Each structure stands twice: as C-alpha cells, then as structure tokens.
Amino acid sequence: NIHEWQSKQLIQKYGGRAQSGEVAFSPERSRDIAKKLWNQFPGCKFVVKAQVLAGGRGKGHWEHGMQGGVKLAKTPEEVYEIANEMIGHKLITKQTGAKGINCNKVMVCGAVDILKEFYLSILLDRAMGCPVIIATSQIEEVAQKCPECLFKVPISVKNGPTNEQLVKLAKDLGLEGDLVQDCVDNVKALYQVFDKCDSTMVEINPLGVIETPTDEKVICCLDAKIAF
Amino acid sequence: NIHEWQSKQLIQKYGGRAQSGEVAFSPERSRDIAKKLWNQFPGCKFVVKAQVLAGGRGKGHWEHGMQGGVKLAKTPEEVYEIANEMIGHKLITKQTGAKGINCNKVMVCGAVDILKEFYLSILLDRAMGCPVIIATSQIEEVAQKCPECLFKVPISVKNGPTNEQLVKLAKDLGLEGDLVQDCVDNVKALYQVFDKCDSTMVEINPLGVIETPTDEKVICCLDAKIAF
Ligand SMILES: Nc1ncnc2c1ncn2[C@@H]1O[C@H](COP(=O)(O)OP(=O)(O)O)[C@@H](O)[C@H]1O
Ligand SMILES: Nc1ncnc2c1ncn2[C@@H]1O[C@H](COP(=O)(O)OP(=O)(O)O)[C@@H](O)[C@H]1O
Ligand SMILES: [Cl-]
Ligand SMILES: [Mg+2]
Ligand SMILES: [Mg+2]
C-alpha cells in the first residue's frame, strides 16, 4: 500500500480532487510550508497530520500527552511545535497497541471548513468477481448496527460504473445541487485509479464536502489509501 | 521604487500581513503555482496580477484586447491562458498612455473574499517636517470631493505612532472587534518598514479586510508600493 500523499496525487492525476498538502521530515520544514502558504491565503490556519503507517490517528496520543495525530494550528510556529512533537516520536492508537509506531514525517495542510464526511471505497469483491463501491455517510460497526445505512453498488467490470449508479449513490449519500455531479466525477476518477492501477482497494476515509476559500462547496478526498 | 512582491515580503518581514502570492516569468510556471496551490486549498480560484512598474492595472487593457491587469481564474489552465496573454505583452493604463508598458512576469494569488478596501499610506510630509499616516475608506479625487473622508495622523518621529493614534485611526475607518488591534499591528509594521528603509512613501492601495479560508476576518495588504 502506498502512503497518503502518493495516493492523493494519483487520484488527482486522474481528475479527482484531494487535499494532499505537503509532507515534511522536520519541524523547521513544516513551519516553512506554513509560512509560504500564508503568502497565498494570509491568516489561514493549518492542519498537521502525522504520516504513520497506521489508522485512527485522530484519537491517539504521544509521549508528552498531546493527544490526536491530526491537530489544528493557528500559525507557522504552532505548526513547528506540533510537528516537533510528532517527528521522531511514537504515536499510540488502536491499530498499534502499547508498542506505538514511530513517526518521521507529517503532512501540513491548509485548514478548511468540512461540512460533511463520507466513507467511500472501491473494493475487488472476490466472491462476486467484480468491483463493488461501498459508501456511507455515517465502517464495520455501521454495517452491523445499520446495514441499510451502508450502500453497496456492484460494478460491471466490462462497462465500469454507470452515471445512473453514481448519480443514485451521490443522492443516496444526501448530496444536492452541483455536489451530485461533483461526486460522480470524483467517483469516476477513483475508479480509474482502481482499474488502471490494478488495485484491490481504493479507500477514501473520509471523502468530504469542504468549502473553498471563497465558500464554494466541493467534493474532496481528505484521506486516501490504495492497496494492490 | 520597489515592486509589489518585494514590498509585501518586506511588510511581512516586520509583522504585517500581505498577500504576496508567488511570481512567475512564464505561463507554464504560473500554471504550476496554481496546480500546487490546489494541493492545499482544493477547488480554490486564482487571481493573476500583471507585475508592471505602473499603476491602475485593475482598469487597464492589453494591446491584443484582453481587459484588466488583475483577472480571476477558475483553474490552473485558466491561469495559463491569462498569464500567456500578459507575459511578453503590452499593458495600457492611465499611467502609461497609448505607448503601453511591457509585462514580463505576473503574480499568481489565491482568490479570497474581500469585505472592505481602504487606502492607507505613510508619507514623509515635507511641509510639517514629519511622517504622516493618510488613510480613507472611500485618492486625489476623494480628498477634493470629500476632504472629511480623509484622515491625516502626524507622527512623532521620536516616539513613533502611539497606540492611541492607531486605535483611533482604526475606529475612524470603521473597524470593530479584533480588526481594530489587527489594524494597529499592521500599521505598526508599515511604519517600521517606512522608518527602517528610509522610505518617502509606503502606500497600501488597497489595504483590505479579507476572509481566511475558514471565514476569519483579518487585515491584509493586497497591494504595496514603497518609494525612496
Ligand atoms: N484540511 C482539514 N481541515 C480540517 N480538518 C481536517 C482536515 N484534513 C483532515 N481533517 C480532519 O482530520 C480527521 C482525521 O483524518 P484522517 O486522515 O482520516 O485520520 P484517521 O486515520 O484518524 O481517520 C478527519 O476526520 C477530518 O475531520
Ligand atoms: N486575492 C484576491 N482575491 C480577490 N480579489 C483580489 C485579490 N487581490 C486583488 N484583488 C482585487 O484586485 C483589485 C486590483 O488590485 P491591485 O493590486 O490593487 O491593482 P491596481 O490597484 O493597480 O488596480 C483589488 O482592488 C481587489 O478588488
Ligand atoms: Cl519559468
Ligand atoms: Mg483516515
Ligand atoms: Mg493598487
């Protein structure tokens, strides 16, 4: 499986929208990324995301407390502080145990208004022998407590997804207006990645509805993981 | 006199907020700047500003038809198109005449919500023999048609501006809440530039109230000109 930054760039290579930010291997560099971003959107806030091969970062904790592998920062100096407590230190989440996985890089992103967060993945379903799109706006828990809340769209491996399936899926997720077609185009892009890269899973957790700096609502992958 | 980019970077060096963007000397580079900015704020729009030693770009026009030296762009490709018609071409404004001034670089900026636009300049007043801060929220026309709309704050070159003078100026311009102190700190930065650079004029036209990507209101220099 390829890292977050690399999957997102692959998704955007194929016409999808994703917040890949920029990766840093030192707190000095993390700060410089933030300072330069203030040239473009002055006053913006920042998000620092520990780049570790492990899930559930948002609710881990570090040696010196901290808590959470995804944290908001108001200034480049706050980016330095947070980054300095991530790089070269050990995060502890559910997927790691008391061991804790080491972190030697972070992702620095501009902070955006997140209006909605969905789960969406494109899986190779061996049983049926076809790709299947799995999405929900609420992943193993939701399927058991509310299986109806989960949508599974089998895909024709010769024709690919139909606009009918994708439009329905988008509306089933609660999207309206321009976000419906926006979601179709992004899901089409995710499928090309799935297909053209011979992936067994393209998982977007979360696929979000965010606001641009000028308040437009757009679909954007806020996380990405591609397996082969 | 130093260019927009250099003044803005100088202003931020001293604690002010300015949208310096990033300068490009080709439309290919302009496009790349926009593409990379979409990694940070996906879906954002862009502004392309012709970098020419001449004023009134917003209302100028180019020899081959295109209108305006400051133009909005929806995508990196729209940035390329606009930049390609600016770099290596001739702009015509009021300050240039039928000759038209050549442009060999543009500034690519993220588009932001602009809520208010002020004029603010720090001048070496020969008559009074001291620096004077000149600001208005409505420059030669306004001074004649509404002299009351213009505020002039003489500065003691030994004490610098007082927080009292700057706070009053901020409220005189109609600012309230956190924007008052925000404006004070930015004006303090503009004065240090004026002083430490032995300038005869630091002109910010417009000094704006803009929204951050997460809807915070902040003071930001959207243009800058420093004379010697
Ligand atoms: N640009 C951003 N602005 C604000 N919040 C963000 C941004 N990017 C990510 N987040 C938040 O970070 C959370 C955790 O992100 P994610 O990469 O999914 O980590 P995890 O493995 O903990 O789920 C997301 O649910 C989202 O709310
Ligand atoms: N980042 C931006 N987003 C939106 N509009 C902008 C941005 N930067 C500048 N503008 C607009 O461009 C106009 C012209 O900009 P400026 O640099 O002052 O050129 P000039 O004053 O020579 O016409 C401003 O009055 C403002 O309305
Ligand atoms: Cl170049
Ligand atoms: Mg995730
Ligand atoms: Mg101007």
A85: annotated active-site residue:
no
Structure tokens at A45: 């806030």
Cα–Cα distance measured from residue B90 to residue B56, given in angstroms and rounded to the nearest whole number:
14
Residues contacting residue A127 through CB under 8 Å, at least 6 positions apart: none
Query: A8 phi and psi, to 5 degrees?
Result: -60, -45
According to the 3-state scheme, what is the secondary structure of chain B?
Answer: CECHHHHHHHHHHCCCCECCCEEECCHHHHHHHHHHHHHHCCCCCEEEEECCCCCCHHHCEECCCCECCEEEECCHHHHHHHHHHHCCEEEECCCCCCCCEEECCEEEEECCCEEEEEEEEEEEECCCCEEEEEEECCCHHHHHHCHHHCEEEECCCCCCCCHHHHHHHHHHCCCCCHHHHHHHHHHHHHHHHHHHCCCCEEEEEEEEEEECCCCCEEEEECCCEEEC
Q: Mark the breaks in chain A: residue after which each occurs, C to N over 2.5 Å.
A: 138
CB–CB of A111 and B211 under 8 A? no
Domain that holds residue B81: 1-228
Q: Is A48 helix (H, G, I), strand (E, B) or coil?
A: strand
Cα–Cα distance measured from residue B137 to residue B151, given in angstroms and rounded to the nearest whole number:
10
Q: Are A109 and A82 in contact (CB under 8 A)?
A: no
Cα–Cα distance measured from residue A211 to residue A189, given in angstroms and rounded to the nearest whole number:
20
Residues of A with a Cβ under 8 Å from any B Cβ are 12, 17-22, 37-45, 109-113, 210-216, 218, 220
Q: What one-character-per-residue DSSP string does A68-126 give? A: -SEEEESSHHHHHHHHHHHTTEEEB-TTTTTS-EEE--EEEEE---EEEEEEEEEEEET
**Beta strand pairing call for A201-211 and A225-227:** antiparallel
Cα–Cα distance measured from residue B34 to residue B81, given in angstroms and rounded to the nearest whole number:
12
Q: What is the resolution of this structure in A?
A: 2.2
Alpha carbon separation from B93 to B68, B73, B204, B225 (Å, rounded): 9, 21, 19, 17
Q: Are A24 and A34 in contact (CB under 8 A)?
A: no
Contacts of B19 in chain A (CB under 8 A): 39-42
**Beta strand pairing call for A201-211 and A114-125:** antiparallel
Cα–Cα distance measured from residue B56 to residue A157, given in angstroms and rounded to the nearest whole number:
58
Angle at the Cα of A72 (from A70 to A77), degrees rounded to 5? Answer: 115
Residues contacting residue A145 through CB under 8 Å, at least 6 positions apart: none
The rounded Cα B105 to chain-centroid distance in angstroms is 17
Q: How many structural domains does chain A have?
A: 1
Residues contacting residue B76 through CB under 8 Å, at least 6 positions apart: B31, B32, B34, B35, B38, B46
Chain B closest CA to A78's CA: distance in Å? 16
Q: Which single residue is written with the structure tokens 């049983």?
A: A127
